[PDB]
């Protein structure tokens, strides 16, 4: 039976990979950073409170100018805000109300949406007339869309619930490349600053790093014990953080191909919805199911502070490009900016 | 403030009033989720998910069929927390067919749906179909193949009563949700009338609990 031989070879390869990972481990980052100054205490206040949504907020994104942001909600609306003055620039009504992801184009021209309808839509903001119209409706997935991100004005990358991630061409409208190899639903995506690689985290408790040009999987990280819900890169493009339902964030390194540090407290028994970094990566923000956010020290694994004030589950948060503010969205239909 | 700033504030106020009007219009709809394991004909017609909109006696309905979403439920069930009710369809003549037993699988799915943590106060509408075929074929095969411990009369009415009891006796915490049962037909829009009655009862309870007197 060739199946038994293939399984034995795969087990041998996994054992060799584990042995190499163990041999590559010399010292721990905790031991290295045990002699660094701790962050004292962080007390941010709600500078702004954006209102106007009528249902649970599922996603949000920041503009490159660090002033304009887009929000997605289950009432079939897509609002672009002015963070400084709490003004609304646009209100886009969608065809399907079951939206679960949103993106803002790096050029500021287009926006995107997706959800349970298997179709990723694209909208055009700057037109000769005074309204926003649909420019394209991409189809070709079999399960729901979880995450969508822009590479340029002509390329988009999406992740689906049928164990596949695809790269699309907006002008043509067809799938240029399809990445396969997962086992369960894919939930989160994150793009590197060089825009040449990206990582995905699925429900089989695994992490996969892809290459856009070649179209293949490079490395596999397996440390978790349950579902994985969120991903986010380190600014330098050599590490990323993961959120899971076992009440544990984790940090992985691309060069060492091993798990570095874990975060866990005996008072945390909930899940993790969103994870983001600061500009320098010293402070790590994670949204929890217990109605408030936690600020973690990325180099000493200590609890710096708590950003409380949300009356329901926080499902999304992000930091500006200049590191000047953060904004958290929650199921209580509110957005708050903290400085 | 300058001229352009004042004009921007005016635009924002217009957007506000449009959003408020849209929300006020949309708050008065009835949302239903359709599930099954069993034939959606006469219940949905009479990729992704399918919308279905209709009006019956001055009420706007939205029926969502999610039969084509073959993925892990536990990661998109929570979108349907605020649905008004659930419609559940069961085949009544699949007791003697192996996929395990079809009706055993139906019971397992019903238990998992009813004992979910997001549906502690959601009414369940139960439709049983193919009653004519079940009555035709009840005489040629006994009921011991599925439930060995029946020990009773082998007639259509008794079998239907036993099945209804078996399906109604699986709701733990039977203090916050009510399960309705019906035998489907094809005359006088009786199915739509039944759905209308169920949603009317649920709406009355929800208004009572929202006004804070119960």
């Amino acid at each position: 039976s060739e199946l038994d031989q293939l399984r034995q070879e795969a087990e041998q390869l996994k054992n060799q990979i584990r042995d190499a990972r163990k041999a590559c481990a010399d010292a721990t980052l905790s031991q290295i950073t045990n002699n660094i100054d701790p962050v004292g205490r962080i007390q941010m206040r709600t500078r702004r409170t954006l209102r106007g949504h009528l249902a649970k907020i599922y996603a949000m994104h920041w503009g490159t100018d660090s002033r304009l942001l887009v929000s997605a909600s289950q009432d079939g609306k897509l609002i672009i805000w002015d963070s400084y003055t709490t003004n609304k620039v646009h209100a886009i009504p969608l065809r399907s109300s079951w939206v679960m992801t949103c993106a803002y184009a790096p050029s500021g021209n287009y926006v995107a949406c997706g959800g349970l309808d298997n179709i990723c839509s694209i909208y055009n903001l700057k037109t000769r007339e005074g309204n926003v119209r649909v420019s394209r409706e991409l189809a070709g997935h079999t399960g729901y869309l979880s995450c969508c991100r822009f590479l340029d004005d002509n390329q988009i990358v999406t992740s689906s619930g049928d164990t596949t991630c695809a790269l699309w061409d907006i002008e043509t409208g067809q799938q240029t490349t399809t990445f396969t190899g997962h086992t369960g639903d894919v939930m989160s995506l994150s793009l590197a600053p060089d825009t040449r690689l990206f990582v995905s985290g699925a429900c089989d408790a695994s992490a996969k790093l892809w290459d856009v040009r070649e179209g293949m999987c490079r490395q596999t990280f397996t440390g978790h014990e349950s579902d994985i819900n969120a991903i986010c890169f380190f600014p330098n493009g050599n590490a990323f953080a993961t959120g899971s339902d076992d009440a544990t964030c984790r940090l992985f390194d691309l060069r060492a191909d091993q798990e570095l540090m874990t975060y866990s407290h005996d008072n945390i028994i909930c899940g993790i919805t969103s994870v983001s970094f600061s500009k320098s990566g010293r402070l790590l923000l994670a949204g929890y199911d217990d109605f408030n956010c936690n600020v973690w020290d990325a180099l000493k694994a200590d609890r710096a502070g708590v950003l409380a004030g949300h009356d329901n589950r926080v499902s999304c948060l992000g930091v500006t490009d200049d590191g000047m503010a953060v904004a958290t969205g929650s199921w209580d239909s509110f957005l708050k900016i903290w400085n | 403030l300058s001229a352009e700033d004042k004009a921007a504030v005016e635009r924002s106020k217009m957007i506000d009033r449009n959003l408020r009007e849209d929300g006020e219009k949309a708050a008065r709809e009835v949302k239903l989720l359709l599930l099954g394991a069993s034939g959606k004909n006469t219940i949905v017609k009479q990729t992704g998910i399918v919308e279905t909109h209709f009006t019956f006696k001055d009420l706007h309905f939205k029926m969502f069929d999610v039969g084509a979403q073959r993925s892990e439920r536990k990661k998109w069930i929570h979108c349907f927390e605020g649905v008004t009710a659930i419609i559940f369809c069961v085949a009544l003549s699949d007791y003697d067919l192996v996929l395990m037993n079809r009706m055993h699988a139906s019971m397992k799915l019903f238990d998992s749906i009813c004992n979910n943590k997001w549906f502690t106060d959601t009414s369940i509408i139960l439709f049983l179909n193919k009653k004519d075929l079940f009555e035709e074929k009840i005489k040629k095969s006994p009921l011991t193949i599925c439930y060995p411990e029946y020990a009773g009369s082998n007639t259509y009415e008794e079998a239907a009563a036993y099945i209804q009891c078996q399906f109604e006796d699986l709701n733990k915490r039977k203090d916050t949700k009510e399960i309705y049962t019906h035998f489907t037909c094809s005359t006088d829009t009786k199915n739509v009338q039944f759905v209308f009655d169920a949603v009317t009862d649920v709406i009355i309870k929800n208004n009572l609990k929202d006004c804070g007197l119960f």
Partner: single-chain antibody, 232 residues
């Protein structure tokens, strides 16, 4: 996207006439509409303004009390009621659209123009340059001045540019400092600070002949300047 103006004619003093304009090719209801007239041999003068939602109506001192402005969104038609005519009303009337949000470009499009002949605390904008000859392939500079500095506390400067081709409606070139509108070649640049303004044309072509204009948008008397004429 086009604007057509209708009406006009010859009215004796003491009479009345109602100008009308029609629009097609864009979302009319979400725009604010202006009125601008031009004397037979003089510059451009601002008359009235109506906003989207009909919530803001601004007039001019010379025409206050004798003019009325209104719009009809369902019919895509604009009006300007006009009573108690005088001998200074002889001009050619225009119609301009304007939209306001963060990053928008007001005054982007211009109408055609109709002629009406009748038988018989304001910022001063100064631009003394006029009748300057031009040569193809050479750089040309146009200056402009104002009494009050145009730099607001929010970091903005509210100044505009317009180009009057021979026998044609004005075209918007630059709407604010260091900003080029759609359809403008990348050889027109505008810079300055405070009360000093300039416009740079690196290589002027044959279509670069006409009259240029300044405009302010700080508060709401609206003032233009005696245009600078460039001829080959």
């Amino acid at each position: 996207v086009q604007l057509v103006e209708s009406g006009g004619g010859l009215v004796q003093p003491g009479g009345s006439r109602k100008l009308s304009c029609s629009a097609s090719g864009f979302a009319f209801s979400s725009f604010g509409m202006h009125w601008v007239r031009q004397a037979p041999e003089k510059g451009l003068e601002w008359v009235a303004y109506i906003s989207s939602g009909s919530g803001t109506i601004y007039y001019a001192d010379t025409v206050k009390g004798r003019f009325t402005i209104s719009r009809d969104d369902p019919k895509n038609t604009l009006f300007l009621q006009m009573t108690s005519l005088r001998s200074e009303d002889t001009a050619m009337y225009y119609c301009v659209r304007s939209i306001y949000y963060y990053g928008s470009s007001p005054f982007d499009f211009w109408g055609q123009g109709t002629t009406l002949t009748v038988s018989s605390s304001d910022i001063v904008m100064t631009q003394a340059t006029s009748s300057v000859p031009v040569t193809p392939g050479e750089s040309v500079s146009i200056s402009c001045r104002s009494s009050k500095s145009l730099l607001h506390s929010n970091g903005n400067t509210y100044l505009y540019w317009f180009l009057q081709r021979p026998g044609q409606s004005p075209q918007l070139l630059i709407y604010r400092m260091s900003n080029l509108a759609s359809g403008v070649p990348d050889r027109f640049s505008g810079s300055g600070s405070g009360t000093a303004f300039t416009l740079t044309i690196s290589r002027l072509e044959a279509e670069d002949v006409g009259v240029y204009y300044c405009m302010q948008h700080l508060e709401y008397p609206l003032t233009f300047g005696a245009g600078t004429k460039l001829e080959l």
